[PDB]
């Protein structure tokens, strides 16, 4: 129950036809290109941490 996938159920932030939250099929490998983005989130958090470490 990620609230960030729940708010679009309501029309306060969602759009029509968005409500059916289902994955494409039962089984499924992860794509490598989306796995690249996890490293970008980690080095972002590292740089943000080191920025606050100056303060």
């Amino acid at each position: 129950l990620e609230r960030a996938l729940l708010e679009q159920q309501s029309s306060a932030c969602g759009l029509p036809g968005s409500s059916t939250e289902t994955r494409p099929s039962h089984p499924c490998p992860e794509d490598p290109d989306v796995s690249r983005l996890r490293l970008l989130l980690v080095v972002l958090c590292v740089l943000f941490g080191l920025l606050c470490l100056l303060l």
Binding site: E2, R3, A4, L5, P24, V34, L41
Partner: peptide, 19 residues
């Protein structure tokens, strides 16, 4: 109590992007 949901989900919605 709020930021941790969005920062986690961003990778899942970018997975759904490519599917």
């Amino acid at each position: 109590e709020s930021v941790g949901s969005y920062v986690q989900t961003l990778v899942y919605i970018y997975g759904d992007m490519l599917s």
